[PDB]
Amino acid sequence: SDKLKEAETRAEFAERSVTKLEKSIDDLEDELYAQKLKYKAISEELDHALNDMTSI
Amino acid sequence: KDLNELQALIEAHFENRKKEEEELVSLKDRIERRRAERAEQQRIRNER
Numbered sequence A: 001s002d003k004l005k006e007a008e009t010r011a012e013f014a015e016r017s018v019t020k021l022e023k024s025i026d027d028l029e030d031e032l033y034a035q036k037l038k039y040k041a042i043s044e045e046l047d048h049a050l051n052d053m054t055s056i
Numbered sequence B: 001k002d003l004n005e006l007q008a009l010i011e012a013h014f015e016n017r018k019k020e021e022e023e024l025v026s027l028k029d030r031i032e033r034r035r036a037e038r039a040e041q042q043r044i045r046n047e048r
Helices: A002-054 B002-047
Strands: none
C-alpha cells in the first residue's frame, strides 16, 4: 500500500509538470512567432527600400 | 563597380536570407501542425 501511494503521487506530480511545460512551450513558440513577424515586416520594408535604391 | 558589386551582394544576401525566412516559415507551419496534432492526441488521451 505504501508503494502504491508513492507511485500515485509521483504520477500526479509528473502529469502536472507536463501540463505546465506544454503550456510554457506553446507560449514561447507564440512569442518567437511574433518576433519573427516583426523581423519579416522590417525586412519587407528594407526590401522595398532596396527596390527603390535599384533606381538610386 | 564597387556600388555594382555591393548592390549585387546586397540583393544576393537578400535572396539568401529570404530563402532562410521561407524555410523558417515552413518550419513554423509544420510547428503549428505539430501543436495541433499534439493537442488532438493529448485530448484523446485525456478523454480516455
